[PDB]
């Protein structure tokens, strides 16, 4: 759990500063947020 959680949180950290960019990939962020919720539920 801890490893995968760390990986997902780092992916989120690398996206979150970019959300105001015109062409930001919201779908990528959304898929990651679904993985984070699902991992927290399972863990």
């Amino acid at each position: 759990c801890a490893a995968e959680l760390a990986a997902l949180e780092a992916e989120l950290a690398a996206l979150e500063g970019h959300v105001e960019e015109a062409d930001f990939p919201w779908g990528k962020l959304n898929n990651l947020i679904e993985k984070l919720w699902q991992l927290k539920q399972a863990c």
Binding site: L12, E16, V19, W26, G27, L29, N30, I33, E34, L36, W37, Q38, Q41, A42
Partner: protein, 97 residues
């Protein structure tokens, strides 16, 4: 009263299971002879937003929970028994049909 930062808002509002107070009648519609106490139960159910008009928040994995509920039958009596309810373990934003 700290202000909630954008990404925290966005993560917390995005489609995921949330505790939702669900009417028992709604789940057990073949039981119109009974009064249930409590009349509603706290269940994990998908909720929140997808932030895309073409998608909707739907369950992709389900589970069950059992609770003690009082069942009242007018002009007979009452008893507390164990009733099972569906919960949502995982939710995804998937295309509207």
């Amino acid at each position: 009263h700290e202000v909630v930062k954008f990404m925290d808002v966005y993560q917390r509002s995005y489609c995921h299971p949330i505790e939702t107070l669900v009417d028992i009648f709604q789940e057990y519609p073949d039981e119109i002879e009974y009064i249930f106490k409590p009349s509603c139960v706290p269940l994990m159910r998908c909720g929140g937003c997808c932030n895309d008009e073409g998608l909707e928040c739907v369950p992709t994995e389900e589970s069950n929970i059992t609770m003690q509920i009082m069942r009242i039958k007018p002009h007979q009596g009452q008893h507390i028994g164990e009733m099972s309810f569906l919960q949502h373990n995982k939710c995804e934003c998937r295309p509207k049909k």
